[PDB]
Design a protein around this ligand. Structure first.
Ligand SMILES: Nc1nc2c(ncn2[C@@H]2O[C@H](COP(=O)(O)OP(=O)(O)OP(=O)(O)O)[C@@H](O)[C@H]2O)c(=O)[nH]1
Ligand SMILES: Nc1nc2c(ncn2[C@@H]2O[C@H](COP(=O)(O)OP(=O)(O)OP(=O)(O)O)[C@@H](O)[C@H]2O)c(=O)[nH]1
Ligand SMILES: C[S@@+](CC[C@H](N)C(=O)[O-])C[C@H]1O[C@@H](n2cnc3c(N)ncnc32)[C@H](O)[C@@H]1O
Lengths: 107, 49, 269, 53, 98, 161, 343, 49, 98, 49, 49, 54
């Protein structure tokens, strides 16, 4: 129930449909490059709209695994550059510094 | 809500404002009278009731 | 036998029967955990986190909101006041919402009703080993008058009765400058004595400062340099050999940095 | 991507094979009606915390 | 159909009797003319109860006709009925053309 | 963020599969330039009906000395973070996280580093032989001296800026 | 009341016409009362026709008083309250700061009240002016206006009878539609009438729709033909028009006093102020009837054969046939010479 | 007849009989040139029960 | 009855009947839990705690919670009968099919 | 009994009620003359002293 | 300019008052009723009941 | 057909058919209440999303 409630709360929210697909009533239209083959197995109700494409590739969802603790990360760099003050302002916007951390032990 | 005029007057005279010292002295004398009587006190309370 | 309350739920001004808490501590905490989720869902439904993530929230409204939700007192009037703008006090002074159970303006002097630092359970029965609650466990033990300047506050207390003593803090008060005025309730869980809560607040803070003096280390910061109150106005109503006067003297001593010859325990009794 | 809650972009899939229908006969009706230990006409759903039906 | 001959309406009717003079009509003139039309169409056909009174307490120069209701969330449904012809108005226009 | 040595973490919202915008990229690059190749850990999780990842790490005066060199802050490539389609639960931040203490190899390397930093003066041309993919010497010697270094294995530091 | 209000436009600087005290609700009123709601409607339509410098503030504070207990506005001092009688705002120094500045009324606290304020600021009628007389022959007795100008408290357009009765371009028709729509919004949700056990929302809605789409020609008349009649009557009056500017909502230009001086300009004498300065308003007040003005605005009508040229020629003939301008001019000669001789 | 859809509960039902100012099209006049209709009626719960 | 606000009444009826035994959070301080039940005749006045079955705490107002569930799940359902014949007659209905 | 039984009128608004009720008692200026009486009392006391 | 009172004052929010239980006098009555409730005990206080 | 009519088009249970949902409501999802013509559609929709990934 909690998962379903969260999903419905996400679906009834603010935003726009960012896809090329808009619902009709005459027939449920299928994109020209959708991997579904249901129209090949059905006699009535399906149409492949040739003049609408979906640029995304075809492959099943590949989900990684979960872990109960954070993992180390190693950055890697590129060519583009920006202003140091710009980076500092952005990190000041994104920061969470005002918190008391566990001190630890020097020696 | 009461109302007052707004225009050049004719210099009325209505002496009413007095000082807290006079109010307190009058109150002290009036308590000096009314205390210990109760036959002039109970009618006051019934009127307020 | 009791519970101490913190930042979110610190506005429980109403009577204890309105809330209907369970009896045992485990049942109590399970109850409150399952109710705070509903409150959270409502608050998120009105304020999306992504658009409102890094902006100040009004602490008065937050405490009053949890307090009204826990007692079913039409908390919706508090919801559009949760995000601050230009001041955490002037916002409530300028608001026109009808909510006087929690605070009421007096022309640049906001008045909020402090509530329930502590909380009592069933098995708490005035025992010699139970922790003292200092009268901060019931509904109304004092009123807080917040303003912007101590001059404005001092002028406010010309036409206000300050006979139970008014207490200031001067160091780093909770939500800005303010005076405290204790009511005439009394603490009972200290049988030989009965204190009228304006001595209770002062005694609590005084003992807390004496505790803090002994544990200083010169490299361990504290959240506040002094905890005492320094009674401000009503001293004319309390002269020599009164508990309020003696506690004022002791609080001054503790602020200057004295220490008790007898060790004070970590959990008072 | 996203409509109102984000959906997986960058890929897209769907089934490929569909089983052929099977007509329902009186023998099947009787076998379903005398619910054996291996195949009952129901299936229990249970809570995800207490783990009970 | 008749009011559009002496006034300005939003219905596309042809006009033949423009070479005849006429005043610059107003609300009172339109209402009067409509009342006369109503009385004539009662006297013919032999009626006695409220043929055209519902429409006469407005401005007859822009008479339309429709209905709608509105749900709580602001959504609206209307029923703008089609306007079927009238052989009487057709015959009136023919008589004017003659 | 005032103390020269301390912790620092940021939180950015990454909804599902997407190319992170210029702003979040610049923010992460700024945090990296501020940290200066210390250990950096990440965590991904849903917090209050949103999915957000945090990056934790500590800063240091060596980090500040490194940051005093670069003119333009480089920009990381966000692929290694965009690929993450998992959940990594958080943990409470700690200043001195290493509970077993440094190892003797690390201590010897730090003796060497201190000796180098004490030997090098200001405004001196240097050249280290076999620095490694991470130019640790960039954090040792002063920020006003050319530091042209050589190593058989290709570096991992920025170019230019 | 209607005709006297229409005629007091020409004498703004001598007599100021206010709505009667009896026309306001009893004891301040309340939105939970159907009678007080109809009181407010009858009152809000008559105010724009009075030459009272502060009609808008009275219109606002009528609803502000009725709305006590359900909505609030910010106050100025610690003396007055939102529930002070709207008829006591008779001078520009009483105008609420929250009325002069809309954005002090929070829409999350005073929805209906801020809507009414916004309507007052946007759709209140606009003053105007029309030419009359013949300043090249008859001169002109205007003092504070230019020599040929007749100030009006409403807008005016050219005259034609063939214009739609339900024209929301007309200022008075637009005002009526806006007031009806706001009262509709007020009564929609029953947020302000807890106590009506039945459901009178549909009945209130229908009656307000009727009031809105009533078939009245009085607004059209006031817009088009009233100024023409005033300008035709003006140059022939025995006591010619004496006006002071009509400021719509600009508070700092509201006239508040009219005196007469008899001493020179380079002398200091006793401050013998004139006798007309001792008025709370700009002139001698006179109260009108909101009920009569409203019903006259709601029920107008023309003859079903009105021809404008014929009608106004036939009306103008017998009144110019009985004119006395040519004697008033000689009278003015004698008055000026008498004043100078006395000095 | 909407059962418990608070979003779909009806609120008004109004008829129009004339265009408004210049808008020739009924689909645009109808929203602001209508009159609402309807009357409530009371019943006896005890008789019904 | 045909009143659209029939369901919110018979909930606020019992809510009124039990004041001091159970409580629910209302919208404001005008339409409180002690206000009459007949006064809730509009869609605008249905309580948030009725449109959400979650704000009625299951151990604070158990009977109110059960009555809310019963109203939402077992209130009667509308239907239709299909009278008439539009061949000879027409169809005078406006906001339903003929 | 006064504590246990108490009821407001069926449909009252307190602003209207008190605006009706309080008005008669604030049109009597018997309170402005007591101030003059206090003036005279203090004057007499000081003159005697 | 101050008036003392033997009970707690608290202004109202609405002009159409409706009943609620949250005040010190109702709390006092509840405390009294609860004390007598747990006082009624046929063993040790009223034998013949 | 005002509560929405639903078809299936692929391989319905017992031949061709439309579905018309009544006005009942689902309650075991507290913040929301769906009138079962959204409920059938939501169930099938989530089932198809599940089937796509596997
Ligand atoms: N309802 C109101 N409670 C206040 C607000 N925050 C603090 N409380 C009260 O504010 C009063 C003054 O707090 P302080 O001056 O900081 O003194 P204090 O020693 O911190 O008080 P405690 O935190 O209770 O120990 C206390 O009596 C609190 O119970 C809250 O956000 N709203
Ligand atoms: N009483 C009637 N129930 C029908 C018949 N067979 C299926 N049910 C209903 O037929 C409806 C349509 O079924 P489908 O169109 O195949 O959709 P569905 O996803 O298969 O429905 P479910 O099997 O319940 O998941 C469903 O709502 C069923 O509950 C049954 O033999 N007789
Ligand atoms: C593990 S590292 C330690 C470097 C250390 N951080 C320093 O610079 O003091 C050792 C490095 O020495 C370099 N060195 C060893 N033999 C290599 C030679 N054949 N070519 C150049 N690099 C030499 C390697 O490239 C290697 O990266």
């Amino acid at each position: 129930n909690r998962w379903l409630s969260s999903f419905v709360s996400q679906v009834v929210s603010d935003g726009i449909n960012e896809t090329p697909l808009w619902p009709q009533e005459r027939y449920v239209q299928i994109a020209y490059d959708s991997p579904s083959v249901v129209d090949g197995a059905t006699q009535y109700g399906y149409v492949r709209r040739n003049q609408l494409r979906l640029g995304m590739r075809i492959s099943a969802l590949q989900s990684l695994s979960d872990t109960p603790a954070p993992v180390q990360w190693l950055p890697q760099y590129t060519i583009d550059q920006v202003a140091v003050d710009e980076g500092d302002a952005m990190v000041s916007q994104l920061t969470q510094l005002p918190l008391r951390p566990d001190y630890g032990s020097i020696w | 809500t009461v109302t007052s005029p707004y225009a050049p007057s004719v210099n009325r005279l209505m002496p009413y404002r007095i000082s807290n010292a006079e109010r307190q002295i009058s109150q002290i004398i009036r308590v000096m009278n009314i205390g210990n009587n109760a036959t002039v006190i109970q009618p006051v309370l019934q009127d307020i009731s | 036998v009791a519970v101490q309350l913190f930042r979110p739920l610190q506005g429980l001004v109403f009577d204890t029967q309105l809330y209907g808490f369970p009896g045992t501590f485990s049942q109590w905490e399970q109850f409150m955990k399952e109710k705070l989720r509903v409150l959270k869902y409502e608050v998120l439904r009105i304020y999306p986190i992504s658009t409102y993530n890094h902006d100040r929230v009004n602490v008065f409204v937050a405490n009053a909101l949890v307090g009204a939700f826990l007692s079913n007192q039409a908390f919706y009037d508090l919801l559009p006041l949760l995000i601050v703008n230009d001041t955490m006090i002037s916002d409530l002074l300028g608001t026109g919402a009808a909510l006087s159970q929690f605070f009421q303006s007096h022309g640049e002097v906001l008045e909020v009703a402090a509530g329930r630092k502590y909380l009592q359970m069933n098995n708490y029965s005035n025992d010699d080993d139970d922790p003292p609650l200092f009268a901060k466990d019931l509904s109304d033990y004092a009123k807080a008058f917040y303003s912007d300047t101590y001059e404005v506050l001092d002028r406010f207390f010309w036409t206000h009765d300050s006979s139970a003593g008014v207490l200031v803090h001067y160091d780093k008060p909770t939500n800005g400058n303010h005076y405290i005025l204790g009511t005439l309730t009394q603490m009972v869980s200290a049988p030989p004595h009965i204190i009228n809560a304006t001595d209770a607040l002062l005694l609590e803070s005084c003992l807390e400062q004496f505790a803090a003096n002994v544990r200083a280390r010169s490299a361990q910061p504290v959240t506040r340099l002094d905890q005492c109150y320094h009674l401000r106005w009503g001293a004319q109503y309390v002269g020599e050999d009164s508990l309020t006067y003696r506690l004022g003297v002791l609080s001054l001593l503790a602020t200057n940095g004295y220490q008790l010859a007898r060790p004070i325990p970590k959990q008072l009794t | 991507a996203n409509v109102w809650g984000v959906r997986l972009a960058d890929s897209l899939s769907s089934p490929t094979i569909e089983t052929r229908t099977r007509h329902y006969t009186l023998h099947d009706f009787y076998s379903d009606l005398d619910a054996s230990v291996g195949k009952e006409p129901w299936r229990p759903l249970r809570n995800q915390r207490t783990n009970e039906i | 159909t008749l009011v559009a001959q002496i006034s300005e309406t939003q219905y596309p009717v042809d006009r033949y009797l423009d070479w005849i003079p006429s005043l610059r009509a107003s609300a009172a003139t339109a209402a009067t003319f409509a009342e006369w039309v109503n009385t004539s169409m009662k006297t013919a056909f032999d009626l006695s109860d409220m043929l055209l009174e519902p429409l006469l307490s407005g401005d007859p120069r822009m008479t339309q006709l429709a209905i709608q209701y509105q749900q709580y969330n602001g959504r609206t449904f209307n029923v703008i009925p089609e306007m079927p012809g009238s052989v009487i108005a057709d015959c009136v226009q023919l008589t004017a053309e003659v | 963020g005032s103390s020269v040595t301390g912790i620092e973490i940021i939180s950015i919202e990454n909804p599902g599969f997407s190319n992170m915008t210029q702003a979040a990229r610049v923010g992460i690059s700024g945090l990296c330039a501020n940290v200066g190749n210390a250990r950096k850990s990440i965590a991904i999780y849903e917090s209050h009906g949103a999915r957000v990842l945090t990056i934790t790490s500590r800063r240091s005066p060596a980090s500040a000395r490194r940051k005093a060199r670069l003119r333009y802050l480089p920009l990381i490539d966000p692929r290694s973070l965009e690929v993450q389609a998992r959940t990594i639960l958080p943990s409470n931040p700690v200043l001195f996280d290493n509970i077993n203490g440094a190892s003797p190899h690390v201590c010897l390397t730090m003796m060497y580093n201190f000796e180098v930093s004490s030997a090098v003066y200001d405004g001196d041309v240097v050249l280290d032989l076999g620095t490694g993919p991470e130019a640790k010497i960039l954090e040792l010697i002063p920020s006003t001296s050319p530091v042209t270094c050589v190593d058989i294995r290709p570096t991992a530091q920025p170019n230019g800026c | 009341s209607f005709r006297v209000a229409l005629a007091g436009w020409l004498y703004n600087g001598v007599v100021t016409t206010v709505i009667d005290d009896s026309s306001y609700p009893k004891d301040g009123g309340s939105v939970t009362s159907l009678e007080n709601l109809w009181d407010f409607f009858i009152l809000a339509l008559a105010l724009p026709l009075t030459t009272d410098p502060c009609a808008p503030v009275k219109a606002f504070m009528t609803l502000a008083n009725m709305m006590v207990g359900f909505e609030t506005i910010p106050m100025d001092n610690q003396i007055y309250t939102q529930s002070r009688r709207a008829s006591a705002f008779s001078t520009p120094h009483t105008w609420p700061r929250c009325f002069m500045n809309i954005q002090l009324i929070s829409p999350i606290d005073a929805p209906i009240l801020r809507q009414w304020a916004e309507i007052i600021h946007r759709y209140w009628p606009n003053p105007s002016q029309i030419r009359y007389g013949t300043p090249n022959v008859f001169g002109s007795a205007n003092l504070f206006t230019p020599p040929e100008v007749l100030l009006l408290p409403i807008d005016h357009q050219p005259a034609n009878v063939t214009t739609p009765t339900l024209d929301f371009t007309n200022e008075l028709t637009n005002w009526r539609a806006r007031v009806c729509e706001l009262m509709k919004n007020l009564v929609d949700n029953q947020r302000y009438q807890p106590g009506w056990t039945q459901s009178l929302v549909s009945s209130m809605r229908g009656t307000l729709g009727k009031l809105k789409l009533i078939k009245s020609m009085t607004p059209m008349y006031l817009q088009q033909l009233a100024p023409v009649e005033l300008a035709v009557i003006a140059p022939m009056l025995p006591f010619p028009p004496f006006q002071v500017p009509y400021v719509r909502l600009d508070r700092d230009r509201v006239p508040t006093m009219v005196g007469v001086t008899r001493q020179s300009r380079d002398t200091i004498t006793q401050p013998a102020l004139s006798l007309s300065t001792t008025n709370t308003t700009v002139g001698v007040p006179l109260a009108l009837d909101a009920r009569a003005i409203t019903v006259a605005l709601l029920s107008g009508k023309y003859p079903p054969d009105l021809v404008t040229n014929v009608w106004y020629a036939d009306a103008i003939y017998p009144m110019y046939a009985d004119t006395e301008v040519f004697s008033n001019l000689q009278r003015d000669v004698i008055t000026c010479e008498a004043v100078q001789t006395l000095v």
